[PDB]
Swiss-Prot record, chains A, B:
UniProt activity-regulation remark: Inhibited by pyridone-containing alpha-ketoamides compounds 13a and 13b. In turn, alpha-ketoamide 13b (tert-butyl (1-((S)-1-(((S)-4-(benzylamino)-3,4-dioxo-1-((S)-2-oxopyrrolidin-3-yl)butan-2-yl)amino)-3-cyclopropyl-1-oxopropan-2-yl)-2-oxo-1,2-dihydropyridin-3-yl)carbamate) inhibits SARS-CoV-2 replication in human lung cells. Inhibited ex vivo by michael acceptor inhibitor N3. Inhibited ex vivo by compound 11a and 11b.
Catalytically driven reaction(s): TSAVLQ-|-SGFRK-NH2 and SGVTFQ-|-GKFKK the two peptides corresponding to the two self-cleavage sites of the SARS 3C-like proteinase are the two most reactive peptide substrates. The enzyme exhibits a strong preference for substrates containing Gln at P1 position and Leu at P2 position
Residue numbers on the Cytoplasmic membrane side: 1-305
Gene name of this polypeptide: rep
Taxonomy, superkingdom: Viruses
Cell compartment(s), UniProt: Host cytoplasm; Host Golgi apparatus; Host nucleus
Cross-link (Glycyl lysine isopeptide (Lys-Gly) (interchain with G-Cter in ubiquitin)): K5, K90
Part of the intact protein present: 3264 to 3568 of 7096
Residues annotated as the enzyme's active site: H41 (for 3cl-pro activity), C145 (nucleophile)
Domain Peptidase C30: 1-305
Outcome (variant: Q189A): Does not affect ability to cleave and inactivate human TRMT1
Subunit structure: 3CL-PRO exists as monomer and homodimer. Only the homodimer shows catalytic activity. Interacts with host FBXO22; this interaction promotes the proteasomal degradation of nsp5.
Name of the protein described by the UniProt record: 3C-like proteinase nsp5
Function (record text): Cleaves the C-terminus of replicase polyprotein at 11 sites. Recognizes substrates containing the core sequence [ILMVF]-Q-|-[SGACN]. Cleaves and inactivates human TRMT1, preventing tRNA guanine(26)-dimethylation of tRNAs. May cleave human NLRP1 in lung epithelial cells, thereby activating the NLRP1 inflammasome pathway. May cleave human GSDMD, triggering alternative GSDME-mediated epithelial cell death upon activation of the NLRP1 inflammasome, which may enhance the release interleukins 1B, 6, 16 and 18. Also able to bind an ADP-ribose-1''-phosphate (ADRP).
Amino acid sequence: SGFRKMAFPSGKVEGCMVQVTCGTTTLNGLWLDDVVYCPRHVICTSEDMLNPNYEDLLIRKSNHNFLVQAGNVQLRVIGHSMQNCVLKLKVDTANPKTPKYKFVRIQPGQTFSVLACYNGSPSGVYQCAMRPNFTIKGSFLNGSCGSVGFNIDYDCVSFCYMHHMELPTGVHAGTDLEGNFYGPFVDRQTAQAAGTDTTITVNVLAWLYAAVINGDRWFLNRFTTTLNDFNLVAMKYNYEPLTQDHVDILGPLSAQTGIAVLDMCASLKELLQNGMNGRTILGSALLEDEFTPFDVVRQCSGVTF
Amino acid sequence: SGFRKMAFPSGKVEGCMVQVTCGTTTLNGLWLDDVVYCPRHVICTSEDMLNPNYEDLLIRKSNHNFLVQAGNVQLRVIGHSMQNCVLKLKVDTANPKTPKYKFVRIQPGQTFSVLACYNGSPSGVYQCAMRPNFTIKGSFLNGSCGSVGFNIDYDCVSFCYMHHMELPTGVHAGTDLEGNFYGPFVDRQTAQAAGTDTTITVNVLAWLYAAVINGDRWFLNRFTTTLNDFNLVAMKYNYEPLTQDHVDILGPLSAQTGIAVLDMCASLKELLQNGMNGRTILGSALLEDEFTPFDVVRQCSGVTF
Ligand SMILES: O=C(Cc1ccc(F)cc1)Nc1cncc2ccccc12
Ligand SMILES: O=C(Cc1ccc(F)cc1)Nc1cncc2ccccc12
């Protein structure tokens, strides 16, 4: 019993974190095989960030301008190149701790664990979701750039996020490990803002199934709804549309609890229109949307890595 | 910016998790140096659990009755002893991955990370707090016994909890790493129940200071309170008494934000009286009590917004 915001075990990623220093800027790098990946803005001064020409800034740097420290050992940079918003520093030593890995680009609504790092040293691990507005509500301070997001499926770490910046509302923006930003953001000190966010409907439904599995049923009702009527209500409350794909993905949870997906949708509609009436669900007074259907099944079944 | 329920990176603990088997029972063990620590109830059958005589059950065992598996390698047990409710299995191999560590017994209100494991394999990591009634609201399924709670301030792992059982309300009971249970619980299947749980007042205050540091002040008021009047009100909402020790511990946060501890107590009193009126504090519609003053200082910026 119990239901917690659970992150993947971070050990496989901790063994990849390094410190990358270029001039006065120090941030984190991810060392996989003989390459260290880090945000390309490590080469910028605060002045350069106003309007940077990364190719022009990079051509002025030699391999020795990049100081890479893995624990208490300095790695020697033997090559450097840029791929989108990520700098790839070729080093002479392959990371002996390199896990089985892949670079995967995730979609809004998908969750992942973030290993927050400072000076190449892991500080904490937390679970978060890629918001529909492509930001993450992370917890990062100065020096956290280059910290990564990941999932684990079997024994393979799927790296999906690299931290680049904090937006004025305190939310965070970054890229996949190929340097493509999530969302309409750029790596430049210029006016940028997160768009209006919405709630990840399929995830709220998954969390309602988790509450039922954990013995919280007060919100269940005898009613059902159509996908179109539910989607009209979801649009009204700034909830993402629920698709037939989402309904299909919730199938196993629906079969285990005996509550049809559209039956859980009628429960959600009632919660949206009436609130919780002083009650909580899994210790929350808000509808939680940062657990996917897969996260719920994994946590309620004890999958290991 | 941002404020998340953040766990310590689990890598140092993942490298210590092993599987312990005694007959038909399999659970987790913590392998540090040449000793594997695990719940003593691994030697019990479900029948033995009403009134087990652990001394009598253990005397019938030899070293070869304990099967310890570290990854895909069987460790050889060369000695066994019981210390309170933990079994210590001496093995013929020191764990090469043993981190710098200590065994620390924590007090209610203290937080820690839990690395949930099944069959000696880590499944997830989450943040927990030792409740005032000495239980933890974990997320644990059958097979999770032997999973541990820890803190990693610096490069030293302070092990503070070992999971032993789930109580009828779905909450969890365990011991420190010397085998002493937290709370009035026993490793017996006799009827046992958690005492009435209360809110960890000092932690709610710490979290209100975290909200002020991150830029939110809507909940502040022009009032102060005496410590005794605060406690008289707070006890009516099932909040733990706030002691002068708690007021002293909140000193640094009070100095950083400029809000006196008793001035924050007045805000808390008003929040208990009024509720949030549709507002949230750090993304929560409830008053959060699983962040300590130390957690807030570690996570938050040293510069208030
Ligand atoms: O945002 C930047 C620097 C930066 C990057 C790209 C860019 F376009 C402009 C500035 N770093 C930070 C990242 N995360 C949390 C932070 C908290 C506080 C301060 C800085 C943080
Ligand atoms: O509680 C026990 C076994 C046990 C130990 C000591 C004792 F005296 C009685 C029973 N195991 C479990 C631990 N945690 C979560 C669990 C969820 C579901 C089922 C079993 C769980």
